[PDB]
Design an enzyme around this catalytic site. Sequence first.
Site, PDB file in Angstrom:
ATOM      1  N   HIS D 220      17.808   3.088  15.433  1.00 23.80           N
ATOM      2  CA  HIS D 220      18.601   3.110  14.210  1.00 23.80           C
ATOM      3  C   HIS D 220      20.069   2.963  14.585  1.00 23.80           C
ATOM      4  CE1 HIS D 220      15.400   5.249  11.498  1.00 23.80           C
ATOM      5  NE2 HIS D 220      14.974   4.137  12.049  1.00 23.80           N
ATOM      6  N   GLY D 221      20.302   2.427  15.782  1.00 18.58           N
ATOM      7  CA  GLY D 221      21.646   2.190  16.292  1.00 18.58           C
ATOM      8  C   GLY D 221      22.521   3.381  16.653  1.00 18.58           C
ATOM      9  N   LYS D 222      21.986   4.598  16.583  1.00 18.58           N
ATOM     10  CA  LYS D 222      22.815   5.744  16.915  1.00 18.58           C
ATOM     11  C   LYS D 222      22.686   6.192  18.361  1.00 18.58           C
ATOM     12  CE  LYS D 222      22.435   7.068  12.054  1.00 18.58           C
ATOM     13  NZ  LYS D 222      21.946   8.109  11.079  1.00 18.58           N
ATOM     14  N   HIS D 224      19.627   6.301  20.474  1.00 20.86           N
ATOM     15  CA  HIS D 224      18.330   6.608  21.077  1.00 20.86           C
ATOM     16  C   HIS D 224      17.273   5.675  20.482  1.00 20.86           C
ATOM     17  CE1 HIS D 224      18.574   9.015  17.305  1.00 20.86           C
ATOM     18  NE2 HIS D 224      17.371   8.481  17.157  1.00 20.86           N
TER      19      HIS D 224
END
EC number: 3.6.4.-
Lengths: 308, 308, 308, 308, 308, 308
Positions: D220-222, D224
């Site tokens: 989700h691009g954060k 991880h």
Amino acid sequence: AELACFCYPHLENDSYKFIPFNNLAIKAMLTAKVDKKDMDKFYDSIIYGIAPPPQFKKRYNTNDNSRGMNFETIMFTKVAMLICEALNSLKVTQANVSNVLSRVVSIRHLENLVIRKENPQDILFHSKDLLLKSTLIAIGQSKEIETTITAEGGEIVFQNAAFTMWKLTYLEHQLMPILDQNFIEYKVTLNEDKPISDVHVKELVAELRWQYNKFAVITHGKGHYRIVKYSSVANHADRVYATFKSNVKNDFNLLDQRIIWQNWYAFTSSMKQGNTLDVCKRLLFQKMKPEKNPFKGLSTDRKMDEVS
Amino acid sequence: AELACFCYPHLENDSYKFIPFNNLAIKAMLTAKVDKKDMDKFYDSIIYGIAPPPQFKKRYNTNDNSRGMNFETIMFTKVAMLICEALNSLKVTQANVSNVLSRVVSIRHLENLVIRKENPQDILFHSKDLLLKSTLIAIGQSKEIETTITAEGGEIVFQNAAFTMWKLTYLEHQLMPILDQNFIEYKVTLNEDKPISDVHVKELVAELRWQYNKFAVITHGKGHYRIVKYSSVANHADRVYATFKSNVKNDFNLLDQRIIWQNWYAFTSSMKQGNTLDVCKRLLFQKMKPEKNPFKGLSTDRKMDEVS
Amino acid sequence: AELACFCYPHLENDSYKFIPFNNLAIKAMLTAKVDKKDMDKFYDSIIYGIAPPPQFKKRYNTNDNSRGMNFETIMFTKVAMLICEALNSLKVTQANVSNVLSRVVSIRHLENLVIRKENPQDILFHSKDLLLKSTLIAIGQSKEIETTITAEGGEIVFQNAAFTMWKLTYLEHQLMPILDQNFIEYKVTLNEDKPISDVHVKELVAELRWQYNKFAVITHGKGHYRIVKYSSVANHADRVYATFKSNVKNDFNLLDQRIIWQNWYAFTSSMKQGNTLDVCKRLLFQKMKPEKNPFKGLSTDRKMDEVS
Amino acid sequence: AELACFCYPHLENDSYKFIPFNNLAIKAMLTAKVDKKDMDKFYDSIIYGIAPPPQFKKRYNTNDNSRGMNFETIMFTKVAMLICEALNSLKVTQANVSNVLSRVVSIRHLENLVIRKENPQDILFHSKDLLLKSTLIAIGQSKEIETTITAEGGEIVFQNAAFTMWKLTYLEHQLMPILDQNFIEYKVTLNEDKPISDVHVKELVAELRWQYNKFAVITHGKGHYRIVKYSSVANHADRVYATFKSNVKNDFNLLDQRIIWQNWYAFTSSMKQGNTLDVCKRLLFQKMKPEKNPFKGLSTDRKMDEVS
Amino acid sequence: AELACFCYPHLENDSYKFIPFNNLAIKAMLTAKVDKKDMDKFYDSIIYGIAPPPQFKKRYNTNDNSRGMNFETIMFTKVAMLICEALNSLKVTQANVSNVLSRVVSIRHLENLVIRKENPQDILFHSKDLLLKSTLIAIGQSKEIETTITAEGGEIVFQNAAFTMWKLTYLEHQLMPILDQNFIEYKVTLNEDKPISDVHVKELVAELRWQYNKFAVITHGKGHYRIVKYSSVANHADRVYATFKSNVKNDFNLLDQRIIWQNWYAFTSSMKQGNTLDVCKRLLFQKMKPEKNPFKGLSTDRKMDEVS
Amino acid sequence: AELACFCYPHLENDSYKFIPFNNLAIKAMLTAKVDKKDMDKFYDSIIYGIAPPPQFKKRYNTNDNSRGMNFETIMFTKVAMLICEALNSLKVTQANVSNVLSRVVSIRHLENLVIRKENPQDILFHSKDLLLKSTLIAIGQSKEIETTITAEGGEIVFQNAAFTMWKLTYLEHQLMPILDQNFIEYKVTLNEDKPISDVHVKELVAELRWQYNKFAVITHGKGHYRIVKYSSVANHADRVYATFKSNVKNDFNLLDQRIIWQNWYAFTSSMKQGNTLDVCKRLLFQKMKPEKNPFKGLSTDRKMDEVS
């Protein structure tokens, strides 16, 4: 409750045969809106057959009532069947039908007969005749007197050559159990409705004075004794009077004066003689002249026996 | 779900007889890889007999679905048997078979009939004929109207000379129970599909205004009333419209205007007249001119009765 | 375990009929002291009939053994009955009797047939003939090959036009369940022992590569596939070799080379060809030249399907 | 749900400190009739303190809702306390307060941190600092990236020198558990947000290809990875796009292209580049040109290892 | 029951302090034979301290009574402690002591305050002052009026800017629960004893007409409303009259005439004016002239809201 | 059992202090082989401290004995502690130690004191002095007489100005409960060991004649009455005689002749006078001359009271 709370009349070839209600037909009726001129007529649930008259809603328990019966138990069905099987053996006429069904009976008595009937050890389970007799007596359609062989039942706590004493277990009932858990009552039927020898009467008084000293020995005049707590005689006097009073619409056997509690014998004789309730009951609350003990030393023998 | 989810056609001597699927044949099919040109054909599990067409997997619940039915319950079998027994009495032809099986029915309705059928107190348990009638009506193979005697069932919460009100217990079902535990719906069938006297209509409106004030009185045009929460009418309008709409492939009984909720009567009349969904539904969300109360004081009488 | 652990021969009119042991006759024998020259003879418990030969104590579980079977379960009786019913249909002679009973069979296979037989949905419950066939095959008295219709059973996790895949539920068994709770094995029978089209083989390989990637696809040469954990192939190789080896006392179907795991096909061909265990097994532990994929893209299609 | 569903601002000496709601204050508010101009203001229950704004009723479960949270669990209190303890360490101003509380957070993430925090073995139970860090990150008040040491938690199913893989146990939660019992998701955090050696990336891809072949590797691009069923990527694409889209009110780490599922890397790059949802998602449903395998033979090694 | 059923006076330095009875001291007294001139004096059990006067046996439940309280529950102790803590804050004199203890209070009210007091979310758990106020009011030693902040408690089913409606859960009580399981009563306290705006009165009437149409809105003149079944008003009228009647030994707040049920407002005004019970009650059983609806359309709005 | 079954002497600075045995030290000793000249010496278990002398094995229950005590209950510990706390307050000398420990005491009496001691309502829980008194009396180290304040305990079934009647609940005990489930005994202690007025003696006789007619009123000469079944007096006579007889190694209070059962008063007086057991007991089994009733009409009053 009336006999009309369990069955309904269906005329079958010059005679009426009675039929049991389905608990659901009753449940349906309890939720029925009926015209005031139909409260006495049998109700038709369409889905579950015929149901009792709406004017009898009070007899059945709903969320809004615990003063009725638990008609949604198998027992209800069994008791209803019991009643029908007895009424059918009578072959009733169009003139008596209503009179018969309007008769109020002891439901606890009928449940107890079912408990006898369904027990293979009990003789009623075998003698279709003794069963019909015991039932006709209980539902008011017999001139015969209840005696041991045809008793309502319960647990035998003492037996003699002349009597049989039973413990009324009304607390265990399914159909209409007694709500007070301190309830204790006994019934003493005669094994044979004939004269009893003083020795067999002495054995019964010993057992009562010793094992049931806190109980008053009374009767409702139908032939057997009723053993009840002293804190209960007042209510038994009221109900007994009511019944007698309904003579304006009726014999009363006072039983052996050596066995009945002195005061109850008084309260009752004063009733058969005619006196009013107030006059009768006053004889119940007064210390009376201790009549000469017919069997002195009974309690002392027992005590000594126990000690040995 | 379609009738094809419970049985399959087996031609037997100039006529088709229908047979129930074994839940395991269904379970087998759910795990079968089928060619796209066989999704509509009956599946053969080899081990458990014939199974429904693979194109119907959606109707059955799997770990990956709760929008279907619980086919692995005895109930499924019972409902399937019920359907077969009715379809067999029809003796269907090679021209109608598919049309019949493709008919979508209310499973909850069929389960409720089984609950009636298996109950010895319920008349359906006795009249093989009333049972076949009640079932044919439910599965779309009858021109007769559902009335009390042939109702789907449930618990009777009110009965009249003209009507019988039932509580739909869909929460207890085995086959396809309603997942929302706040679900409450009632159905009011006519005991007899004839004209009712104003007094018997007044009794029913009193019970609804008093005991079900938070419910909207509506209908799906098939002859009986449906009592549902007001926060539900919107969905009942949608489904009712859909059905009507499928006329492009159809009569609608609006019922007594004194009993139906004002707005639903509007929404529906505006539907029979032809209007669009948007036009119809708008009549559902607007405070309308309170039509003259046909039975004023009904709620007040009840209140006073209750107070006494 | 040998067939002699469930029944004993009783010659009845030119032919032997087989009879089940009572678990108690077995229990008695387990506690019997027997002369070394009677270990092979049938034991007489006097009280519970005939029991298996004392030399078979190992096959039954006692406090001192969990490597045997739970003969004190109804299942034991059922499995014993199953075996007898099949052996009786053979009418065996005094020359074959011992040879038949000395045959070692898979108990789990026999229990599973009972689970099929007793299930009214399963066809074996109806075709006494299919049941006898499935049983004769399982107990080594048939030249027929096990296929779907006569499979040992279990839960169907995938079905095709050509195959049926089963989940072996050995963990639930009564008679001789698998003690390791991580046990998982599948069996893939052919629905019909004939040639299969490449498309139906492709469907089965897709399901295996996708849904069972951690499993090795092998066989024991008796006609069906066996799906087992890769950390288990070694043991399957050993047992398979042992059996083959007992040819000194024997055909082996290697099955479709596009379905069998490359290495197992190697290990097995090298066995049919004659090579030693050491030579064969070495082919099991070596990364081999990836033979050209017969059906490339199968896993990718599935993935895309899943994504949609 | 917003942070405003757990606490309310109380200005204390040049700074705001946040306070937890009592579940009963919330219960009270759910039954409160509020003026339309007060839906956003904090509600006063008089008896149980301050409660969240009425406009947030949707977030809490009532009989009429299961799309909210189970605020009447201790967990709710714990999660609310967790949030307050972190917000208090910030000392927020009258200009940011609302912006902070209007921030929507993952409740499941916060519950999992509580499960870590309360476990004496977990380091968060000891480092008040690591706990505040892990929490600030989760509630959107940190520029730091979630890594293993500060992960939300769950059960460790695989650990490496570079990564730690967790099984998300959302099914067990008290506050807001996932209703679908087939739910399975994993999260792969970096132990250290620095460059990883090809060997440690190869170990992680092996574990995913072997032990999680039916799962799509996405993010989700954060910072991880998120391991989810392929039949779930579509929903993850939608939610991810929504978020990105809210840039009109925002960096996205695409992670290692050798680990992310080919299509998701496509769908995402096409998103960062600017393309529309329709354009992006189409890249999700199409079989793409199999890019050269960066680590070939990984699955084969594992298989051979398992076989030995 | 009187306050004397929970505590006894012990003069401590120019003032009386009250002390709780041990349930066992009470149990002892229930089995004590006392001289008729000591029925009012405090009983000494020797072993368990002081006990209430023998003349109060009726208030406690024994096997021979269910019309009393369950003094052998911790609750009894808690309620007794509550009472003492309030009476002690008064510092009563030798002239008032008996008058105070002879005061009859609502036990259910006191139990509910304990339920509030022991709940950490409830404000009473924190304000020793609000707790003493709420208690003094309940036990008759306060001129203050019960309002929301000091209400007896229960479950809040509706809250407004002016009112708070509570569901009386008397069925769950330990000390003296209501035996009828159909019991349902609500209480509506004012949040602030000041004048309320027509809009906030309109909100409360809407909720009552819609959500409690089968209930009569009444009061006992002490400042709050009481919501009870219509089949209960008769009993509330009797008890209310009795109390008023005891003026021969007394203000009555009739509350908002737009909220109180028309007839109860009548029955009550006719009471404050002086009329007899018979005269007053007759006003309860008669359909009266429907006074002009102060808030017409309230029920219709709700219905429409619900529909949307 | 002797006091030596619970503690052992440890001389501490010119005086002995007593210590409780660990149930395990006892368990160890029960399995110890001891030289015949050490049966009386304290046993050392090495692991669990000191244990009672091996000659006392009989007092403890083992699989081979139920005539002892259940030393592996916390109660044992509690009773042992009770004894030690009392013996320690005595500061015994090297000359008395053995004499003290060889004293046989009623274990049931000691358990009952623990039940009093641990109950916060019971005064013993508060007066360390009353507790030591009640205990010293029970263990034979006091010249004081047991009275109500220091009674062993049980449930108070009747209390008077002069007496307190207790129901001995020996069936519930942990340490050494009575095995016969028909056991029922009562104890009547004097509240104050002084002369009682005829009226208070009359109240007690009424309660006994009415509520306990099947019980014999006796005593063991230590100051209080013992109410026991008549079928038990024989055993009480034997034990009482034994004790008296041990005068060869001793005062006996015959108590109020108007309360003690006539025969027991005889049996006992004939014992104090010197007569033999045979002579004494014969007075127990003979119907004696009914001495003039000191309080005639007592039973009749009660009956009348009950009736009203």
